[PDB]
Design a protein around this ligand. Structure first.
Ligand SMILES: CCN(CC)C(=O)[C@@H]1C=C2c3cccc4[nH]cc(c34)C[C@H]2N(C)C1
Length: 245
């Protein structure tokens, strides 16, 4: 999954197709390539050593994990919200797009990503038990998980549910039907690969059963960083040719 993530994103970074909307997909592919080289391979060492953490970098590793995970989720939310306005009223969307929105959009999805994960090393790096190890380097803040995973997933999820319901409502002519199938695959994969981890994360707060469930579901969430390059790009004839060359 690590090799797949890195090899999938470094093939999308070169291919950039210099559109104002395609550059935003490079900012999404940069939030996942970093996730695939800094955060993800560290967890492979933890899997090898059986949850024992080789010590002051544990709070740093969680900071990057929350940062790149929230940066990815709101990249897809911004894409989904932008894709709805481009489909509802395309005339008024083209007038107000001067290649400054795309730079203003990268600012917004990285200000909230870095603003939500800022409590981790500013209050939690001094305390070695709040955002810190139970012997295993977990995120033991029981009140930040409830509200920090609420605005990071469930608010981007209720935004995506209304955006997806409204977009399909406004898309209903084969090209419109081909697009409706692309939205379904994109929406279904984001839910099925991130939602399983977040219900288990918050329902938890038998330990052995839940400890095994959260272990596998974490890697299902990581695996979505290998797929995001493909489902958001490879539907384009140009990208398929670019990957082959
Ligand atoms: C096994 C230990 N690890 C790995 C460092 C975690 O618990 C990570 C903690 C996360 C987490 C907590 C709280 C809020 C959040 N938003 C987004 C994420 C998040 C990402 C999420 N990653 C995928 C797992």
């Amino acid at each position: 999954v690590i090799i797949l993530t890195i090899a999938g994103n470094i093939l999308v970074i070169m291919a950039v197709l210099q559109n104002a909307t395609n550059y935003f997909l490079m900012s999404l592919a940069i939030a996942d390539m970093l996730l695939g080289f800094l955060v993800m391979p560290v967890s492979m060492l933890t899997i090898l050593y059986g949850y024992r953490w080789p010590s002051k970098l544990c709070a740093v590793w969680i900071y990057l994990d929350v940062l790149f995970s929230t940066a990815s989720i709101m990249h897809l939310c911004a894409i989904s919200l932008d894709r709805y306005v481009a489909i509802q009223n395309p005339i008024h969307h083209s007038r107000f797009n001067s290649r400054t929105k795309a730079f203003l959009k990268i600012i917004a999805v990285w200000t909230i990503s870095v603003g939500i994960s800022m409590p981790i090393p500013v209050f939690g790096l001094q305390d070695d038990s709040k955002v810190f190890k139970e012997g295993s380097c977990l995120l033991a803040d029981d009140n930040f998980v409830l509200i920090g995973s609420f605005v990071s997933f469930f608010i981007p999820l209720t935004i995506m549910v209304i955006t997806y319901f409204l977009t399909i409502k406004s898309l209903q002519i084969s090209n419109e039907q081909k697009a409706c199938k692309v939205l379904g695959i994109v929406f279904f994969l984001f839910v099925v690969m991130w939602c399983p981890f977040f219900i288990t994360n918050i329902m938890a707060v038998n330990e052995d059963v839940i400890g095994a469930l959260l272990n596998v579901f974490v890697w299902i969430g990581y695996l979505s960083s290998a797929v995001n390059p493909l489902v958001y790009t490879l539907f384009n004839k140009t990208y398929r040719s670019a990957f082959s060359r």
